[PDB]
Write an enzyme that holds these catalytic residues in place. Structure first.
Site, PDB file in Angstrom:
ATOM      1  N   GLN D  11       0.738  -1.673   0.229  1.00  0.00           N
ATOM      2  CA  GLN D  11      -0.239   0.252  -0.177  1.00  0.00           C
ATOM      3  C   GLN D  11       1.093   1.609  -0.277  1.00  0.00           C
ATOM      4  O   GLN D  11       0.769   2.451  -1.169  1.00  0.00           O
ATOM      5  CB  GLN D  11      -1.272   0.157   1.470  1.00  0.00           C
ATOM      6  CG  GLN D  11      -1.858   1.384   0.690  1.00  0.00           C
ATOM      7  CD  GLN D  11      -3.240   1.643   1.766  1.00  0.00           C
ATOM      8  OE1 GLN D  11      -4.479   0.215   2.343  1.00  0.00           O
ATOM      9  NE2 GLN D  11      -2.962   1.873   2.814  1.00  0.00           N
ATOM     10  N   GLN D  15       0.737   3.784  -2.756  1.00  0.00           N
ATOM     11  CA  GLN D  15       1.099   5.075  -3.149  1.00  0.00           C
ATOM     12  C   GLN D  15       1.213   6.099  -2.981  1.00  0.00           C
ATOM     13  O   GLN D  15       1.344   8.027  -3.581  1.00  0.00           O
ATOM     14  CB  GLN D  15      -0.097   5.358  -2.182  1.00  0.00           C
ATOM     15  CG  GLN D  15      -1.753   4.367  -2.158  1.00  0.00           C
ATOM     16  CD  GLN D  15      -2.548   4.690  -0.875  1.00  0.00           C
ATOM     17  OE1 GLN D  15      -3.501   3.868  -1.268  1.00  0.00           O
ATOM     18  NE2 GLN D  15      -2.417   4.865   0.686  1.00  0.00           N
ATOM     19  N   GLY D 143       4.185  -3.193   7.285  1.00  0.00           N
ATOM     20  CA  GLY D 143       3.094  -3.631   6.082  1.00  0.00           C
ATOM     21  C   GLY D 143       3.829  -5.436   6.589  1.00  0.00           C
ATOM     22  O   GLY D 143       4.573  -5.930   6.307  1.00  0.00           O
ATOM     23  N   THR D 145       3.392  -6.736   3.381  1.00  0.00           N
ATOM     24  CA  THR D 145       4.492  -7.067   2.161  1.00  0.00           C
ATOM     25  C   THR D 145       5.070  -6.143   2.207  1.00  0.00           C
ATOM     26  O   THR D 145       5.947  -6.948   1.343  1.00  0.00           O
ATOM     27  CB  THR D 145       3.193  -6.592   1.242  1.00  0.00           C
ATOM     28  OG1 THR D 145       2.041  -7.076   1.148  1.00  0.00           O
ATOM     29  CG2 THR D 145       3.568  -6.213  -0.258  1.00  0.00           C
ATOM     30  N   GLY D 146       5.054  -4.784   1.983  1.00  0.00           N
ATOM     31  CA  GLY D 146       6.045  -4.195   2.261  1.00  0.00           C
ATOM     32  C   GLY D 146       7.537  -4.369   2.491  1.00  0.00           C
ATOM     33  O   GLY D 146       8.373  -4.317   2.519  1.00  0.00           O
ATOM     34  N   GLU D 183       4.248  -4.101  13.830  1.00  0.00           N
ATOM     35  CA  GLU D 183       5.116  -3.802  13.010  1.00  0.00           C
ATOM     36  C   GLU D 183       6.130  -3.574  13.444  1.00  0.00           C
ATOM     37  O   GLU D 183       7.425  -3.555  12.327  1.00  0.00           O
ATOM     38  CB  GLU D 183       4.373  -2.210  12.877  1.00  0.00           C
ATOM     39  CG  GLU D 183       3.195  -2.082  12.091  1.00  0.00           C
ATOM     40  CD  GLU D 183       3.026  -0.909  11.325  1.00  0.00           C
ATOM     41  OE1 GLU D 183       2.119  -1.105  10.307  1.00  0.00           O
ATOM     42  OE2 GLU D 183       3.481   0.381  10.783  1.00  0.00           O
ATOM     43  N   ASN D 206       6.928   8.382   9.818  1.00  0.00           N
ATOM     44  CA  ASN D 206       5.061   8.930   9.669  1.00  0.00           C
ATOM     45  C   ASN D 206       4.818   9.961  10.608  1.00  0.00           C
ATOM     46  O   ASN D 206       3.850  11.097  10.034  1.00  0.00           O
ATOM     47  CB  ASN D 206       4.393   7.733   9.335  1.00  0.00           C
ATOM     48  CG  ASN D 206       3.884   7.481   7.460  1.00  0.00           C
ATOM     49  OD1 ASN D 206       4.363   8.503   7.270  1.00  0.00           O
ATOM     50  ND2 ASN D 206       3.367   6.181   7.812  1.00  0.00           N
ATOM     51  N   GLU D 254      26.832   6.971  -7.191  1.00  0.00           N
ATOM     52  CA  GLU D 254      26.683   8.573  -6.881  1.00  0.00           C
ATOM     53  C   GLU D 254      26.476   8.929  -4.732  1.00  0.00           C
ATOM     54  O   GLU D 254      27.076   9.414  -4.586  1.00  0.00           O
ATOM     55  CB  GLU D 254      26.661   9.571  -7.546  1.00  0.00           C
ATOM     56  CG  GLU D 254      27.962  10.990  -7.080  1.00  0.00           C
ATOM     57  CD  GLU D 254      27.845  12.101  -8.534  1.00  0.00           C
ATOM     58  OE1 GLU D 254      27.453  11.660  -9.329  1.00  0.00           O
ATOM     59  OE2 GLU D 254      27.560  12.802  -8.274  1.00  0.00           O
TER      60      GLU D 254
HETATM   61  N1  GTP Z   1       3.169   8.093   4.946  1.00  0.00           N
HETATM   62  C1  GTP Z   1       2.614   6.552   3.962  1.00  0.00           C
HETATM   63  N2  GTP Z   1       2.393   5.553   5.415  1.00  0.00           N
HETATM   64  C2  GTP Z   1       1.174   4.861   4.663  1.00  0.00           C
HETATM   65  C3  GTP Z   1       0.624   4.305   3.332  1.00  0.00           C
HETATM   66  N3  GTP Z   1       0.221   2.899   3.092  1.00  0.00           N
HETATM   67  C4  GTP Z   1       0.640   2.527   4.785  1.00  0.00           C
HETATM   68  N4  GTP Z   1       1.206   2.879   4.938  1.00  0.00           N
HETATM   69  C5  GTP Z   1       2.367   2.729   6.311  1.00  0.00           C
HETATM   70  O1  GTP Z   1       1.875   1.760   6.117  1.00  0.00           O
HETATM   71  C6  GTP Z   1       2.617   0.618   7.505  1.00  0.00           C
HETATM   72  C7  GTP Z   1       1.536  -0.706   6.975  1.00  0.00           C
HETATM   73  O2  GTP Z   1       2.057  -1.073   5.609  1.00  0.00           O
HETATM   74  P1  GTP Z   1       1.128  -0.617   4.463  1.00  0.00           P
HETATM   75  O3  GTP Z   1       2.011  -0.487   3.132  1.00  0.00           O
HETATM   76  O4  GTP Z   1      -0.184  -0.300   3.860  1.00  0.00           O
HETATM   77  O5  GTP Z   1       0.858  -2.911   4.655  1.00  0.00           O
HETATM   78  P2  GTP Z   1       1.283  -3.802   3.202  1.00  0.00           P
HETATM   79  O6  GTP Z   1       2.412  -3.810   2.741  1.00  0.00           O
HETATM   80  O7  GTP Z   1       0.381  -3.317   2.197  1.00  0.00           O
HETATM   81  O8  GTP Z   1       1.232  -5.165   3.384  1.00  0.00           O
HETATM   82  P3  GTP Z   1      -0.670  -5.992   4.119  1.00  0.00           P
HETATM   83  O9  GTP Z   1      -0.132  -6.504   5.349  1.00  0.00           O
HETATM   84  O10 GTP Z   1      -0.593  -7.047   2.774  1.00  0.00           O
HETATM   85  O11 GTP Z   1      -1.227  -4.506   3.179  1.00  0.00           O
HETATM   86  C8  GTP Z   1       1.623   1.707   8.065  1.00  0.00           C
HETATM   87  O12 GTP Z   1       2.707   1.698   9.237  1.00  0.00           O
HETATM   88  C9  GTP Z   1       1.212   2.872   7.967  1.00  0.00           C
HETATM   89  O13 GTP Z   1       0.624   4.072   8.295  1.00  0.00           O
HETATM   90  C10 GTP Z   1       1.007   5.865   2.892  1.00  0.00           C
HETATM   91  O14 GTP Z   1       0.306   5.890   1.392  1.00  0.00           O
HETATM   92  N5  GTP Z   1       2.068   6.565   3.132  1.00  0.00           N
END
Ligand code: GTP
Ligand code: GDP
Ligand code: 6ZR
Ligand code: CA
Ligand code: CA
Ligand code: MG
Ligand code: MG
Lengths: 53, 319, 422, 439
Positions: D11, D15, D143, D145-146, D183, D206, D254
């Site tokens: 996400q 985004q 996240g 995934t992230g 997290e 954040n 660089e």
């Molecule tokens: N700055 C910012 N932080 C984000 C955003 N979306 C999610 N987060 C942060 O990301 C963390 C959650 O991770 P996500 O990116 O939503 O999780 P994911 O990678 O989609 O993994 P899943 O658990 O499978 O959905 C939290 O700390 C959220 O505050 C965004 O659009 N902008």
């Protein structure tokens, strides 16, 4: 305070100012670990099914 | 109802401030590790300033200044004075100082080595006996001021409070800690004028009460005996020294735009020589107080360092 | 498309399941015909979590109705929203279960379970991405309890990697059908500890008290109690049913609310229980008062491991956080410190019918142990004299299975006590 | 010319990716249809913007990007949003069900089954590159995934492109926005696994962005859109030197050279100014001195921490707008005498400056006002270690009681990967301790 390495162009410029000088894992190892974790899952699921039986 | 925690259990003054905070009925204490606090009264060592100011909806405050040890360790103090532009090398109220390792300065120490009696702590006349203590080396002040009758040395402790706004508050009341024992010359009792080799070996609190003389008393003595006052002969220099030190380190420790805020209580220690000149001994980051003062002061802290930040339902001079 | 399959079983299970569907069907703008006449698309964006689409584009609950006798389901059918349900989805026997866990689990219920699993399979197989299952039942009777737990076992066997969620009504002497309720509930809790991921403990003692010492109902009917249950169930599922800044689903919920796999029994809370809308500060105070809890444990006797809270209606997100954070930082004695950021808050704009402001609370508290003690004490008071046991030995059970179920409940209690003191 | 490939994961990654690409298109004058009027070499080129865009015979400019999420809903908004024409459908990759905030589920369980498809779609992009420098990977720490999928992808990119540079933009977790109690776990895990595979990682707390949006845009409750637009201003500043004519930070190699002397200590702190509200009726345009000075306020840092109490290893200033070197050196002069700015002994006290005369672009109807000059500072201070210590402590609080661990074990992970991850971070804290502090 010295300026050094100055570069100009139409978009802007770059430079460096100084105040003082100074006194890999292989594919196979990945596959191993990613499969030793499938096994643990499978094992857990097999325990579950045994108990359900 | 405001909240706070306590991370130095055996801190005389802060023990008293904790106790005083509950008596208002507006402050609850929490357990050491509960991060949802308004106020920490942190540890003396490795206070985790890194974890302060990251709790949503909490203004947080702590009773120490990160980086204040710059002034409170003698090695660092010397380095700070010799090195700071706003202090110059010899600013005239700090003893000639060198820092030597078990900088260091050994060489330049010897160039100005041609009254050549010193002191190296963290007293000798000959270099060897101290240098072989394998710290800081200073010029021991040979001709101090003596109280009479008794030919008795003494040091002065002053208490400084610095708030979150960096107002500098000097507590009205200071204390004289005397070696109420006659003063020889090169016999090792009166030389260490404090309760650090007298609470064991040293006839305890003779000429004056618990070795401790107060300000009214000493001012009268200064009048009668010297035709001067405490303010004129001594306090101007003290006020100047405190200002110079704290104002020196201000931009490195200030919490004016930080995500948490700080205050801290210091104890400055001075010596007056016979010419009525004031010298700075050292700066203590966690001082104790003095029995009959741990009250007016401890409440002063609450008034100015705390309820200023956390308003409820003067004993200090501004510098 | 994260579909949920809903199952309701027994008298209580079908009575509250039916109310549940009444409430949420109204929130989604579906009428008793399965026809949509709402005014927003916030109603329709996630309508498929709970509803399947029709040929004429009608909406039909993904619901399976189960009982071992037909009475209640005849009532459900003849009730206000009765005709909304898929008729193939009514599965029932004729003989009943006599408030007997053994009949629901082992004899009478065994004979019906496969036909139920058939309707389940039929509903799962047309799911784009099925999340899991939601079961409504009581633990004090025979069908919802014995057969409900049996069902959960079978479902776990056939869908081991889907989430199982229950709304489980706990018995109380105050509002009681028979004396064997503690037996049936102790046997059922044992199943729930091993085979669910999330269980909402709905205590009938609490619902009676809220109905009596608060709503000022002097003779509270099952309809009164079910009205609280209906509101709580609607609140607790708001984040699944509606689009928000959170994507809520059952698995993420379980991951964030359950730190130890066995401690997944939640105390729900609701506020308010009226023309003056409540203010955010009142919602917050009320929600966390014992008097707004629906499990009849006092949260000050234990500690919160985790908490999830939603606020419904158009209000001040800033004032919410302020208030939330405030009630924590006023009551830190009752939250664990070793789980950072264990209270989570959300907001939906759509409130529920008849309130412009509401708040719903899901708490995983160790104080829930009080409920399990209450049951254990009652179980033991009879079992120590083997009282009433012939009803179960006559269906094939042995005392041994009882002694084990007792043991596993007392272990559960010891576990909650261990974490209340950490 | 030398291409760069951007990978957005989860996400946050996706985004934030949307925000950045929108910005890139507004800055280079590319339209939602992928048309770039000012690109006079139709269907090809090797201008600087071609580092981030390839072209098609019909004059469409196409992001050298790959979006990847384990669930489809976020990337669907891309599949059918304002910029649907920009991307090749095959650049947007979605799974069925997400990682449920579980690192292990993103890494081991679900990752295993989408990874080859991802690497493949990436190969199709590398194959269109004459001299690929490497990768830019955007993701959250928090996240499933992230964290999990990212560390798996980073493990494989090192194997399939052992010569390429890899840079991260990572979202560090904050309670006022977060989505999950685990997290910290995911953060440590992904940091441990990803550490030896990345060359330079820009952390964005954040909390810091939320505070900045509140304090300077006077937004009560900042949205993801607000946060993201601001983060995209920063990313744009950092990446501006790969897409425009210039002589500082011209390739990803660089970044490493200029900001990272020690391979492990590769997290430079970013500071940015100024941030100005679009509904600020009367605004006094700020000066070089003033904005450069703001680069030493914590309240403007991407990660709150206090650099006065650490040491520097590198400092890069990046200005955009009405700026000339003279005013820069004047501001540096004044600042050097007011602030405490200690470098480590084995590195030069100095600054690498870079300027672009085009001032910041902003989204029309955005919340950021247009400014005449702006700067982003990239420094490498040991003070950022504070952010590790916070994260680790939270981890320690939960892991002592083993809370939540069973969700991870249940996916195939062993409890040992937790104590290993944590040991690695203990080692990292220690390293920063040496470089920055005196015994
Ligand atoms: N700055 C910012 N932080 C984000 C955003 N979306 C999610 N987060 C942060 O990301 C963390 C959650 O991770 P996500 O990116 O939503 O999780 P994911 O990678 O989609 O993994 P899943 O658990 O499978 O959905 C939290 O700390 C959220 O505050 C965004 O659009 N902008
Ligand atoms: N709250 C609530 N409790 C009920 C209702 N009906 C029965 N109960 C309770 O459920 C238990 C009896 O179970 P019941 O559902 O009647 O038996 P079943 O048909 O075998 O599942 C007792 O604890 C009753 O107090 C109801 O509609 N609402
Ligand atoms: C830390 O505790 C949390 C508890 C719950 C959530 C979210 C996410 C797991 C989700 O789904 N949650 C959720 C679900 C909810 O219902 C499904 C809910 O209220 C109804 C709610 O209120 C805050 C949160 C996130 C969390 O960080
Ligand atoms: Ca039969
Ligand atoms: Ca071209
Ligand atoms: Mg001393
Ligand atoms: Mg009944």
């Amino acid at each position: 305070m010295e300026v050094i390495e100055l570069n100009k162009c139409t978009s802007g410029q770059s430079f460096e100012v100084i105040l003082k000088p100074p006194s890999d894992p292989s594919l196979e190892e990945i596959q191993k670990k990613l499969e030793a974790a499938e096994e643990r899952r499978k094992y857990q699921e097999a325990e579950l099914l045994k108990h359900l039986a | 109802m405001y909240t706070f925690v306590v991370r130095d259990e055996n801190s005389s003054v802060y023990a008293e401030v904790s106790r005083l905070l509950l008596a208002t009925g507006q402050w609850k204490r929490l357990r050491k590790d509960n991060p949802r606090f308004n106020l920490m009264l942190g540890e003396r060592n490795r206070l985790p300033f890194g974890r302060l100011g990251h709790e949503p909806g909490l203004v947080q405050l702590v009773n120490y200044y990160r980086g204040a040890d710059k002034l409170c360790r003698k090695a660092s103090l010397v380095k700070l004075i010799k090195t700071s532009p706003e202090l110059s090398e010899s600013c005239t109220w700090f003893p000639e100082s060198y820092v030597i390792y078990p900088t260091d300065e050994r060489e330049v120490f010897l160039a100005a080595y041609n009254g050549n009696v010193w002191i190296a702590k963290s007293i000798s006349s000959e270099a060897s006996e101290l240098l072989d203590f394998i710290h800081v080396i200073q010029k021991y002040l040979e001709k101090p001021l003596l109280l009479e009758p008794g030919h008795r040395k003494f040091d002065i402790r002053s208490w400084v409070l610095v708030d979150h706004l960096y107002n500098i508050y000097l507590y009205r009341e200071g204390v004289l800690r005397t070696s109420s024992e006659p003063y020889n010359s090169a016999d090792k009792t009166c030389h260490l004028t404090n309760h650090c080799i007298q609470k064991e070996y040293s006839n305890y609190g003779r000429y004056e009460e618990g070795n401790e003389m107060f300000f009214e008393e000493f001012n009268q003595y200064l009048m009668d005996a010297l035709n001067t006052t405490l303010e004129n002969s001594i306090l101007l220099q003290i006020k100047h020294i405190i200002r110079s030190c704290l104002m020196c380190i201000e931009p490195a420790i200030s919490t004016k735009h930080l995500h948490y805020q700080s205050f801290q209580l210091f104890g400055f220690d001075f010596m007056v020589d016979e010419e009525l000149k004031v010298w700075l001994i050292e700066v203590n980051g966690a001082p104790a107080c003095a029995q009959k003062l741990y009250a007016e002061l401890c409440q002063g802290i609450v008034d100015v360092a705390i309820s200023s930040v956390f308003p409820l339902a003067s004993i200090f001079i501004k510098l | 498309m994260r579909e949920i399959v809903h199952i309701q079983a027994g008298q209580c299970g079908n009575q509250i399941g039916a109310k549940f569907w009444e409430v949420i069907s109204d929130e989604h703008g579906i009428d008793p015909t399965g026809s949509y006449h709402g005014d927003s698309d916030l109603q329709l964006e996630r309508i498929n979590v709970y509803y399947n689409e029709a040929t004429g584009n009608k909406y039909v609950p993904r619901a399976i109705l189960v009982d071992l006798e037909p009475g209640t389901m005849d009532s459900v059918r003849s009730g206000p929203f009765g005709q909304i349900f898929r008729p193939d989805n009514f599965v029932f026997g004729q003989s009943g279960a006599g408030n007997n866990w053994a009949k629901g689990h082992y004899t009478e219920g065994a004979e019906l379970v496969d036909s139920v699993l058939d309707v389940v399979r039929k509903e799962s197989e047309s799911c784009d991405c099925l999340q899991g299952f939601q079961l409504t039942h009581s633990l004090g009777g025979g069908t919802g309890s014995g057969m409900g737990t049996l069902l959960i076992s079978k479902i776990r066997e056939e869908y081991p990697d889907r989430i199982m969620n229950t709304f489980s009504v706990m018995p109380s002497p105050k509002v009681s059908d028979t004396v064997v309720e503690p037996y049936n509930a102790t046997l059922s809790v044992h199943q729930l500890v091993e085979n669910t991921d999330e269980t909402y403990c709905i205590d009938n003692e609490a619902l009676y008290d809220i109905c009596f010492r608060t709503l000022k109902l002097t003779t509270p009917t099952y309809g009164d109690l079910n009205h609280l249950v209906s509101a709580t169930m609607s609140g607790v599922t708001t984040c699944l049913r509606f689009p928000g800044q959170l994507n809520a689903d059952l698995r993420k919920l379980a991951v964030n609310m359950v730190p130890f796999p066995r401690l997944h029994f939640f105390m729900p809370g609701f506020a308010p229980l009226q023309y003056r809308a409540l203010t955010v500060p009142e919602l917050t105070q009320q929600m966390f008062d014992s008097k707004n809890m629906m499990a009849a444990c006092d949260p000050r006797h234990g500690r919160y491991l985790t908490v999830a809270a939603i606020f419904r209606g158009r209000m001040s997100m800033k004032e919410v956080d302020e208030q939330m954070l405030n009630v924590q930082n006023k009551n830190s004695s009752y939250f664990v410190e070793w789980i950072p950021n264990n209270v989570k808050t959300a907001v939906c704009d759509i409130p529920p019918r008849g309130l412009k402001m509401s708040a719903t609370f899901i708490g995983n508290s160790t104080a829930i142990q009080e409920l399990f003690k209450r049951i254990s004490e009652q179980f033991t008071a009879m079992f120590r004299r083997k009282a009433f046991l012939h009803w179960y030995t006559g269906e094939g059970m042995d005392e041994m299975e009882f002694t084990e179920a007792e043991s596993n409940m007392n272990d559960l209690v010891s576990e909650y006590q261990q974490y209340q003191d950490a | 010319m030398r291409e760069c490939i951007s990978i957005h994961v989860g996400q946050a990654g996706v985004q934030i990716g949307n925000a950045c690409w929108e910005l890139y298109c507004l800055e280079h004058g590319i339209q939602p249809d992928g048309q770039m009027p000012s690109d006079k070499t139709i269907g090809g080129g090797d201008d600087s913007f071609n580092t981030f865009f390839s072209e098609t015979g019909a004059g469409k400019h196409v992001p050298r990007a790959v979006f990847v999420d384990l669930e489809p809903t976020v990337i669907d908004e891309v599949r059918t949003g304002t910029y649907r024409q920009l991307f090749h459908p095959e650049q947007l990759i979605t799974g069925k069900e997400d990682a449920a905030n579980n690192y292990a589920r993103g890494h081991y369980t679900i990752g295993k089954e989408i990874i080859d498809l991802v690497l493949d779609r990436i190969r199709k992009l590398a194959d269109q590159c004459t001299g690929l420098q490497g990768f830019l990977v955007f993701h959250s720490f928090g996240g499933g995934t992230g964290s999990g999928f990212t560390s798996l992808l980073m493990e494989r990119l090192s194997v399939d492109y052992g010569k390429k540079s890899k840079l991260e933009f990572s979202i560090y977790p904050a309670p006022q926005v977060s989505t999950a109690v685990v997290e910290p776990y995911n953060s440590i895990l992904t940091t441990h696994t990803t550490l030896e595979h990345s060359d330079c990682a820009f952390m964005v707390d954040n909390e810091a962005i939320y505070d900045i949006c509140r304090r300077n845009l006077d937004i009560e409750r900042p949205t993801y859109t607000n946060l993201n637009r601001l983060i995209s201003q920063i990313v744009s500043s950092i990446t501006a030197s790969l897409r425009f004519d210039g002589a500082l930070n011209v390739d990803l190699t660089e970044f490493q050279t200029n900001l990272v002397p020690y391979p492990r200590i590769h997290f430079p702190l970013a500071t940015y100014a100024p941030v100005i509200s679009a509904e600020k009726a009367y605004h006094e345009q700020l000066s070089v001195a003033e904005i450069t000075n703001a680069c030493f306020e914590p309240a403007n840092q991407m990660v709150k921490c206090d650099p006065r109490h650490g040491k520097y290893m590198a400092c890069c200033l990046l200005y955009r707008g009405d700026v000339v070197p003279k005013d820069v050196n004047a501001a540096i002069a004044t600042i050097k005498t007011k602030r405490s700015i200690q470098f480590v002994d084995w590195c030069p006290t100095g600054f690498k400056v870079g300027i672009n005369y085009q001032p910041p672009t902003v989204v029309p109807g955005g919340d950021l006002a247009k400014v005449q000059r702006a700067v982003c500072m990239l420094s490498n201070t040991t003070a950022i270690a504070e952010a590790w210590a916070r994260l680790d402590h939270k981890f320690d609080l939960m892991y002592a009681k083993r809370a939540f661990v069973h969700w991870y074990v249940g996916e195939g992970m062993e409890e040992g990967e937790f104590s290993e991850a944590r040991e690695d971070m203990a080692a990292l804290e220690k390293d920063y301790e040496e470089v920055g502090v005196d015994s």
